[PDB]
Design a protein around this ligand. Structure first.
Ligand SMILES: [Cu+2]
Ligand SMILES: [Cu+2]
Lengths: 125, 128, 359, 124, 359, 128
């Protein structure tokens, strides 16, 4: 018994494209679902980053907390659509992988930032 | 048997969040493969076995040890065992005698490479 | 590892739904790009970065996107690299780069500056060093194969839909120069027409209202000239006024950039117009869109311009797109009077050109 | 000379407005708002040898003057005081009177920074 | 030939009047730049292009501008070139480029990511591949001479004003790592302090309130920690609260990026604060600016924050500049309570860092 | 004397908007220097002598001639004389017998290189 809320594609566009969507609680960039991609897919021609910053978000629909991996899509200039700047549980650089003030496209073949995705890792425990 | 091959990718993940060791096993060998392709200097991985709530402490002390000490304080008494730090394409292995895991207590395996233990953490248990 | 980020995906919407908005991003011209939209629902489909003042077009076969731009080893210093890049239309991924002499036209996006021959075999582009010339690129060979210097003093490319590899260009003498290429892209022959319009007394906008065998042009003062190329030589005629005495009183005149369009199946020409025209308003936003019947030379319709500056027509679906710089308007022009279907807001920051994907 | 023929003498709110009489054919950013002046490139930007020509009307003396619109190049868009005036502007077939083409095109580095309004002389 | 366009000019205003606003232009990050303003009249003086997410600082001698950025043969593809460029401060012209390993930190402009030693001999920068390390550049030799890998797991550079070539860095163990360079830029010695703060229970903002021989830090919950480095080893202490019971009730906490500042001559520390703090608001715009007396540990003043996010202090003139992302506020802090002198609007599109030219 | 050196720069300008020819002069030599550095293909200059209100016509016809004909219709009867088209750093010269300039009529010199005659136009006159 997963739960409808655990899958963006079934959620109204107005919901997942809002900076208020529960799993975008630590996004600092542009939502890929508004750039020709989806919450878990890079828009055509953009490259997924192997690394990312981690957020612990609260799913208000099931009352549980989940780990979200914020991977970037790289290789293209700023998407400029659906800019979000949420900092829930975000921490400074000394806790590097929980920090979102650094471009997570940094290790890619090409580091120019295109947009940000919100991948569901699993329950936070 | 007394074998296990755990993977690590450029995405900072282990292909296992739990490994079981049969009681029949005398000593235990744990092999690590780095399936990614980023150099160890940027995304190296290792596996460190230690007491579950004694993990944070080891990673912090390991960070201060440096890559020269595979990010594990030299001779840290809290470590049951630890592999070397490998990079993309590389592989390593560690053999430790299971006679070390204490009764009732919980043990987790993880990567001490700076910042990875938060996600690359798992639980290693005995028999059943 | 519940979910995983994936790439290598293709444009979600089918080609028949895609349009391309060339966002010059003039405030930061070094980061211009092409926004790909679905004209049926206004959904953003993807994009292609085009560096400093890039130009774009879709291959006639609809399988590739062609861009033209300029690079510098350090952007604002270092070696200059003018090029044409070939991008796959469905994956929106870079495929090939074609070296161009460091003189490709740098300026606003008029269609005529970056076109292709009817056979889709050659890319025809405009140069300015500032001496002008038209360069030829063999798409297949991926090369710059000819430098048409005979075009000096002329401007913009106007393909001839009734010929495999011929095009014309407007010259400073008020006439049209026709270039016919050989199978290898090199000029085979050329011919100049008689003076079509007075440069100093009645300048035409370079945007053509293209038909299969002829092209129409509008002037700063509302006149209409035409260049018929169904015969061996180009037959020029004109002008006739888009204005009736009533219109002349209000001082109506055409205004915009890619301001004209022609629905071939009906002979209807669309023009961006505005009242109180005078020196310096030839690029003003459209107060209205006038629909002229080129056959009878009469206005059949007039509607709000919604401040558009550029447009484009799709013959197959009988659609018209107008662009005011940041928003796209979708129109149904199957009937004499246009019909506004939807408006796509924020399609761009600073765009003066929109194009349908070929079908 | 005539007090209207020299910018250094007019209030800056005057010369930094797209309405200033000599900016009648500018399509870019006024250099006087980018660290330069109506006739001087901002520090670090390079003057273009070529330009587009405009015939502007000086409402202060009722005469028409030729204005040479040279660009300052070598730096990214200034982004300040964007103007888009087309008085007497003509299409590409009259190239040097056309302002829809980057006049930084022949420079060592063609990226456009800002536009200047140089006074050539009386139009005759 | 009445007038002639000239170039080669120097900044009109005198150095003592210039400030630098690092405009990241995040909407088009590939065209970030540095805007140079005159803080006395808010006049725009010039600029330095810094490509994709560039960082900047002025040499301690005030004669050169240092930038750090990233280039790609084709911007979005091709070979990557990380570099440090040396620009002349008065002519704002490019002078030298220094190759850097392709791992210079790419991110927001915290001061601590691009600094220089007190003697102005070396440029100390932050790397992330994502493994972190601190790189050393010998300005004179124009080279990258050392890679401090001992800093792995640590972040940001905090120069020691009481030493010629020593600096510290915050580490994941909650402690500070001190690096002392030799005359050639290579690490001569290092030392780690005791745990200064709890990473998980009371994280500090990386921005330091730097004094000559010590640095102060504020935490997510309003605590103040300090690192005294007047002695051989760093002496850490803390915390003490910026809050009184009344403040705690309103839930006041610090917020911003380069959110703290220290007026050395008085010991007064400035902090961006906001009410109703809670998880996720550590970067919220400032509701107020609190002025603390580090000596007596008491709040001496509080004023409107004007939504600032970053600030910077000038010890010599007793000035403070706050930046809300697009506007700069000039303050006189010679007295306990700040005094708003002027506001410079539209200094940038997206800037989180402003710096005075050294005097 | 019967000499004149006229310059042309990358800025599309002549360093003279009027040249006088002494009546004593039999034939007249006019030398042209291109002080700029842009190739002739992009900013080449030339000098063409012709009747003042017969200038526009020659430049238009010259444009159609092409660079191969130094932007002057081969054998145009309206041209008193014309130099070749030179590029940056280059120089050329033209010698024509003054016995050609008609009485009462006005004569202007200019560059026929596509688009330059608008600014690179001058007036060449006789004695006084
Ligand atoms: Cu690891
Ligand atoms: Cu010339």
């Amino acid at each position: 018994a997963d739960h409808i809320s655990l899958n963006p594609d079934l959620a109204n566009e107005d919901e997942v494209n809002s900076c208020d969507y529960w799993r975008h609680c630590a996004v600092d960039g542009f939502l890929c679902s508004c750039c020709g991609g989806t919450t878990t897919t890079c828009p055509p021609g953009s490259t997924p980053s192997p690394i990312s910053w981690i957020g612990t978000c609260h799913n208000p629909h099931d009352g549980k907390d989940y780990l979200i991996s914020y991977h970037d899509c790289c290789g293209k200039t700023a998407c400029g659509r659906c800019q979000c700047n949420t900092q829930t549980r975000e921490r400074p650089g000394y806790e590097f992988f929980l920090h979102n003030d650094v471009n997570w496209c940094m290790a890619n073949e090409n580091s120019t930032f295109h947009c940000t995705t919100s991948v569901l890792v699993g329950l936070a425990k | 048997a007394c074998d296990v091959s755990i993977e690590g990718n450029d995405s900072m993940q282990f292909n296992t969040k739990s490994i079981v060791v049969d009681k029949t096993c005398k000593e235990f060998t744990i092999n690590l493969k780095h399936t990614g392709k980023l150099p160890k200097a940027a995304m190296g991985h290792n596996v460190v076995v230690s007491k579950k709530s004694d993990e944070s402490a080891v990673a912090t002390d390991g960070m201060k040890a440096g890559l020269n000490n595979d990010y594990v304080k030299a001779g840290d008494e809290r470590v049951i065992a630890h592999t070397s730090v490998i990079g993309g394409g590389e592989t390593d292995s560690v053999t430790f005698d299971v006679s070390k895991l204490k009764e009732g207590e919980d043990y987790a395996f993880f990567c001490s490479f700076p910042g990875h233990w938060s996600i690359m953490k798992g639980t290693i248990e005995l028999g059943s | 590892p519940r979910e995983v980020l994936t790439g290598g995906h293709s444009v979600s919407a089918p080609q028949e739904n895609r349009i391309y908005v060339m966002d010059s991003v003039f405030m930061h011209l070094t980061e211009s790009r092409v926004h790909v939209y679905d004209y049926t629902n206004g959904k953003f489909l993807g994009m292609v970065p085009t560096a400093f003042n890039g130009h774009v077009q879709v291959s006639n076969d609809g399988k590739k996107i062609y861009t033209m731009t300029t690079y510098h080893e350090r952007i604002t210093r270092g070696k200059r690299s003018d090029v044409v890049e070939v991008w796959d239309a469905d994956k929106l991924t870079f495929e090939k780069e074609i070296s161009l002499p460091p003189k490709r036209v740098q300026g606003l996006n008029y269609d005529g500056l970056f076109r292709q021959t009817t056979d889709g075999k050659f890319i025809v582009l405009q140069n300015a060093s500032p001496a002008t010339s038209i360069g030829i690129v063999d798409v297949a060979k991926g090369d710059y194969v000819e430098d048409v210097t005979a075009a000096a003093g002329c401007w913009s490319v106007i393909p001839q839909p009734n010929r495999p590899r011929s095009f014309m260009t407007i010259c400073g003498d008020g006439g049209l120069l026709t270039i016919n290429l050989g199978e290898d892209g090199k000029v085979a022959s050329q011919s100049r027409s008689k003076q079509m319009f007075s440069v100093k007394d009645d300048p035409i906008f370079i945007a053509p209202a293209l038909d299969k065998d002829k092209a129409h042009f509008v002037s700063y003062y509302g006149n209409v000239y035409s260049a018929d190329f169904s015969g061996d030589e180009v037959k020029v005629d004109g002008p006739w006024s888009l204005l009736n005495d009533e219109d002349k009183a209000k001082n109506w005149v055409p205004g915009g950039y890619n301001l004209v369009g022609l629905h071939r199946a009906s002979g209807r020409m669309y023009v961006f117009m505005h009242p109180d025209g005078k020196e310096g308003t030839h690029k003003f936003p459209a107060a209205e869109i006038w629909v002229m019947d080129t056959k009878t030379k009469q206005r059949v319709a007039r509607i709000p311009g919604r401040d558009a500056l550029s447009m484009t027509i799709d013959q197959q679906r009988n659609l018209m797109l107008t662009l005011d710089g940041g928003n796209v308007n979708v129109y149904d022009i199957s009937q004499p009077e246009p019909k506004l279907l939807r408006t796509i807001e924020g399609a761009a920051e600073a765009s003066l050109q929109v194009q349908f994907h070929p079908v």
